[PDB]
Design a protein around this motif. Structure first.
Motif, PDB file in Angstrom:
ATOM      1  N   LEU A  73      65.439  40.801   9.296  1.00 21.03           N
ATOM      2  CA  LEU A  73      65.193  42.092   9.934  1.00 21.03           C
ATOM      3  C   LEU A  73      65.794  43.236   9.125  1.00 21.03           C
ATOM      4  CD1 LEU A  73      65.559  41.265  13.739  1.00 21.03           C
ATOM      5  CD2 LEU A  73      63.489  41.498  12.312  1.00 21.03           C
ATOM      6  N   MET A 118      61.035  50.802  21.770  1.00 19.19           N
ATOM      7  CA  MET A 118      62.037  49.745  21.783  1.00 19.19           C
ATOM      8  C   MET A 118      61.434  48.453  22.330  1.00 19.19           C
ATOM      9  SD  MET A 118      65.766  49.638  23.641  1.00 19.19           S
ATOM     10  CE  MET A 118      65.114  49.319  25.276  1.00 19.19           C
ATOM     11  N   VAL A 119      61.578  47.360  21.571  1.00 19.88           N
ATOM     12  CA  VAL A 119      60.961  46.079  21.929  1.00 19.88           C
ATOM     13  C   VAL A 119      62.044  45.067  22.219  1.00 19.88           C
ATOM     14  CG1 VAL A 119      59.268  44.329  21.229  1.00 19.88           C
ATOM     15  CG2 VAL A 119      59.253  46.679  20.240  1.00 19.88           C
ATOM     16  N   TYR A 120      61.928  44.365  23.349  1.00 19.16           N
ATOM     17  CA  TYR A 120      62.922  43.356  23.717  1.00 19.16           C
ATOM     18  C   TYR A 120      62.560  42.059  22.989  1.00 19.16           C
ATOM     19  CZ  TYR A 120      65.322  46.106  27.175  1.00 19.16           C
ATOM     20  OH  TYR A 120      66.087  47.079  27.786  1.00 19.16           O
ATOM     21  N   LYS A 121      63.516  41.495  22.268  1.00 21.00           N
ATOM     22  CA  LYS A 121      63.253  40.252  21.516  1.00 21.00           C
ATOM     23  C   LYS A 121      62.778  39.121  22.423  1.00 21.00           C
ATOM     24  CE  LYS A 121      66.536  41.035  17.735  1.00 21.00           C
ATOM     25  NZ  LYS A 121      67.804  40.472  17.195  1.00 21.00           N
ATOM     26  N   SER A 139      65.565  50.268  13.449  1.00 17.99           N
ATOM     27  CA  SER A 139      66.844  49.621  13.645  1.00 17.99           C
ATOM     28  C   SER A 139      66.663  48.461  14.616  1.00 17.99           C
ATOM     29  CB  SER A 139      67.902  50.602  14.157  1.00 17.99           C
ATOM     30  OG  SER A 139      67.527  51.125  15.409  1.00 17.99           O
ATOM     31  N   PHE A 140      67.719  47.686  14.792  1.00 21.39           N
ATOM     32  CA  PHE A 140      67.670  46.576  15.729  1.00 21.39           C
ATOM     33  C   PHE A 140      69.102  46.260  16.076  1.00 21.39           C
ATOM     34  CE2 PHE A 140      69.306  43.315  12.896  1.00 21.39           C
ATOM     35  CZ  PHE A 140      69.052  43.838  11.632  1.00 21.39           C
ATOM     36  N   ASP A 141      69.289  45.501  17.146  1.00 20.60           N
ATOM     37  CA  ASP A 141      70.605  44.952  17.449  1.00 20.60           C
ATOM     38  C   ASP A 141      70.369  43.536  17.908  1.00 20.60           C
ATOM     39  OD1 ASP A 141      69.895  45.004  20.188  1.00 20.60           O
ATOM     40  OD2 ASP A 141      71.031  46.861  20.577  1.00 20.60           O
ATOM     41  N   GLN A 142      71.308  42.951  18.628  1.00 16.82           N
ATOM     42  CA  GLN A 142      71.170  41.544  18.990  1.00 16.82           C
ATOM     43  C   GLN A 142      69.966  41.303  19.898  1.00 16.82           C
ATOM     44  OE1 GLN A 142      74.686  39.961  20.714  1.00 16.82           O
ATOM     45  NE2 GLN A 142      73.746  37.988  21.277  1.00 16.82           N
ATOM     46  N   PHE A 143      69.590  42.311  20.669  1.00 20.90           N
ATOM     47  CA  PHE A 143      68.605  42.090  21.722  1.00 20.90           C
ATOM     48  C   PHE A 143      67.300  42.860  21.590  1.00 20.90           C
ATOM     49  CE2 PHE A 143      72.700  40.970  23.689  1.00 20.90           C
ATOM     50  CZ  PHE A 143      72.437  39.645  23.963  1.00 20.90           C
ATOM     51  N   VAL A 144      67.300  43.957  20.836  1.00 21.51           N
ATOM     52  CA  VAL A 144      66.099  44.771  20.753  1.00 21.51           C
ATOM     53  C   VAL A 144      65.767  45.159  19.323  1.00 21.51           C
ATOM     54  CG1 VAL A 144      66.497  45.684  23.105  1.00 21.51           C
ATOM     55  CG2 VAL A 144      67.334  47.011  21.083  1.00 21.51           C
ATOM     56  N   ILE A 145      64.514  45.544  19.103  1.00 26.48           N
ATOM     57  CA  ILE A 145      64.094  46.105  17.825  1.00 26.48           C
ATOM     58  C   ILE A 145      63.485  47.488  18.117  1.00 26.48           C
ATOM     59  CG2 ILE A 145      62.496  45.920  15.888  1.00 26.48           C
ATOM     60  CD1 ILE A 145      62.635  42.788  16.262  1.00 26.48           C
ATOM     61  N   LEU A 146      63.892  48.500  17.365  1.00 26.67           N
ATOM     62  CA  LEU A 146      63.280  49.834  17.467  1.00 26.67           C
ATOM     63  C   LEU A 146      62.201  49.995  16.403  1.00 26.67           C
ATOM     64  CD1 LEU A 146      62.988  52.657  18.707  1.00 26.67           C
ATOM     65  CD2 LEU A 146      64.848  53.396  17.203  1.00 26.67           C
TER      66      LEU A 146
END
Ligand SMILES: [Cl-]
Ligand code: NA
Lengths: 71, 68, 67, 66, 67, 69
Positions: free
Chosen positions: E8, E49-52, E34-41
């Motif tokens: 990612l 914003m997309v929930y994994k 960007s992204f974090d542990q749970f979502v991708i922007l």
């Protein structure tokens, strides 16, 4: 925390009972349970396919099976 | 709080052998009686006992009103 | 759970008519009888137990108090 | 967490109308009133509680900067 | 994790166009902002914003060379 | 039962470059070789390269038998 799941799957495995495994999408898999862990079940025929438990809805034995507890 | 409601509810269905329907997230309706259950699955009896993953369950509907 | 618990408790205490939509689009209707961390007991003809994993949205039939 | 919280918080604070698409494809619309680890409360005639496990995407009606 | 994160992050750093297919079959397109542990922007024509949890596959428009 | 079946199984498919089909929870079938994987995703490659979330996988089906774990 699989105090029922583990012995039930272990019985199906040891007894080589043909099962149907229905997936959350309605697809039906068939075969014999070869092994399983916390997350997957290995279901055998032509090859052994690896089924994720998150995608399983119900495991249906092809004939009645006697639970033992303790497996 | 869970499973402070779920456990006694299923246990009541189990002990009283209450006819129930279990609806799955794909819409399939299973019917029978609760034979046993644990944290993650329910064993539903009819011609055989099938193991249902709770992850795949939407609703459990008793065929009649049940107490607590 | 910060928000769910008070929200569901208000619905339960006030006996607010609600719709619960499931992840597959089905609409359940009734009132919240009780709940715990993982399920909601939804009353109408009988009390059915709904797994929260299978719920998409809970829609009250009228406005409910803050929060 | 590091992206999700500031993103929802910004939408909440700026009262930006959003569309929330559920895993079944249904589109919800409203303004984000509050949220926690598990749910988002989405306001219009009533405030509906949406489980994040059921959400696909949150699409703001307009450009937002976090 | 040891693969998802560099993958990612590479798509992000190199502004690689991607298609994100959801569990319901719907296709999203854009670049990963960007992204974090749970979502991708995801940004572009549509910003969102997309929930994994809802993602099945991430298909980059060209292969990624990982560190 | 089983310890961790998933890792050695995926590793065998990866190391031996075994063609597999990955069926997703919406019935869609993906095909290719396992390039790599971690706890949550599988990177599949051949006609298309793609990262698949395991949460969305129902079953992984090798094109040929895979050695015992
Ligand atoms: Cl309200
Ligand atoms: Na790639």
């Amino acid at each position: 925390g699989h105090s029922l799941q583990d012995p039930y799957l272990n019985t199906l495995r040891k007894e080589r009972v043909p099962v149907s495994i229905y997936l959350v999408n309605g697809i039906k898999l068939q075969g014999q349970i070869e092994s399983f862990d916390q997350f997957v079940i290995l279901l055998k025929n032509t090859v052994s396919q690896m089924v994720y438990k998150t995608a399983i809805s119900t495991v249906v034995p092809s004939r009645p099976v006697r639970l033992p507890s303790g497996d």
